[PDB]
Design a protein around this ligand. Sequence first.
Ligand SMILES: *P(=O)(OC(C)C)OC(C)C
Ligand SMILES: [Mg+2]
Ligand code: NA
Ligand code: NA
Ligand code: NA
Ligand code: NA
Ligand code: NA
Ligand code: NA
Length: 480
Amino acid sequence: SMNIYLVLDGSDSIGASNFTGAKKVLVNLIEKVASYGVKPRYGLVTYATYPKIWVKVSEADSSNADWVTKQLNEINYEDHKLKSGTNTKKALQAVYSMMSWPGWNRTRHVIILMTDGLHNMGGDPITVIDEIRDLLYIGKDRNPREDYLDVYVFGVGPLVNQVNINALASKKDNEQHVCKVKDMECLEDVFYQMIDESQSLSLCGMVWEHRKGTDYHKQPWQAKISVIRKGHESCMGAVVSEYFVLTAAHCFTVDDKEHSIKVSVGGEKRDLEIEVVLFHPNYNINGKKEAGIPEFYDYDVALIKLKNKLKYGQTIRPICLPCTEGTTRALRLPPTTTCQQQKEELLPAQDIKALFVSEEEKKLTRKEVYIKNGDKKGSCERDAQYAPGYDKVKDISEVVTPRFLCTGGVSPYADPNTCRGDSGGPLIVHKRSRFIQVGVISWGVVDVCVPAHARDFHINLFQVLPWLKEKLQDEDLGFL
Ligand SMILES: *P(=O)(OC(C)C)OC(C)C
Ligand SMILES: [Mg+2]
Ligand code: NA
Ligand code: NA
Ligand code: NA
Ligand code: NA
Ligand code: NA
Ligand code: NA
């Protein structure tokens, strides 16, 4: 159990712009905390001469991040009256009241005060902190229970009194509880002191975003694949579970032997050994030559089962898959959500903002593109005609089957195009600070490694769910 008390100074010394800026920090915090699957009870207070309580931890809705965010958004600087005064002592007493009891010992408390440190009214605020610690029985039995309280102070503005701010903040070894708001490094650090990573390792679509993170931290699901032959092939893939990596079928051949295939994840020097490669039963690169289709990429998906079971860390995590319980929670949706609903949410009828990862000279970069899934779709699909060996395809809708997603082009924006090596990589949708794989990079219209018809086609994972559900039925992924 965890309660987070947002206390924001709204007196004269703060000002409209910075008061707004302060809310932003709080809005981002609420958002980042929620993305970790954590649901604390929130307290929202503003203050000047007196405090104004906008949210109390006891309200049922206090634990609904969307609601609390809404409230915080509706707060207007001018809403708080009597700005001539600043009584931080009182503001803290309003927090006290929320903790006051007219399983208490198992609830953690985090106070986040945003002020410039200049209280010109009331007594010394430290008093209330003392009262609070007393109330929570902290620092009594040398069982201290120091872990149950955290007082963070975010100094707002240019004219801050560092002494007072330092005075109220918690004082814990190896930790920082004071941060100037303009300092983003400090604010970033606070977050990781507040939330326990360990509790979110089993979460799909998670990313450690800290500034010190590497390429593997930023793309934890990313898996590089090598095939030694003839020419050596290179492909990307995604970790979907501790035993499986999802990729493109055309990256292999029934002639490639298990041992000639190696997988690399998490920025590790070593390579991994696979047990077997599972191609989608319907994949047949030669099944449409007669219809004028040399290479046929319908159902171009494959699941590589590793010999050894992976362990999730900050450099190795699974990505979320369509229509699973992981995606529902990642999307913060009720347990009654359907596959169809997830689809309407992840893939709406329009230009969908998505991304894919590409290796650019040792470094992994994110390539933002748009999925033409609206009235601009059909147009994107037709461009397939300009593809090598497709100039005589009877009906083009025969190559661009109902399994493909279409990206690339000049509108709505100049999308970048996949390069040789990206095949098999995940086509992702970023929502609620989480990452959802909606496709598998399959093939492109043009080799741009540009023309308005340089398009890229991906396998819509929604169109192969029966297969995924079947092959991953034991990976504890909870498909719907
Ligand atoms: P993929 O790596 O990349 C295309 C989709 C551009 O293609 C095979 C030849 C590896
Ligand atoms: Mg003031
Ligand atoms: Na709401
Ligand atoms: Na003690
Ligand atoms: Na950990
Ligand atoms: Na480490
Ligand atoms: Na669920
Ligand atoms: Na669909």
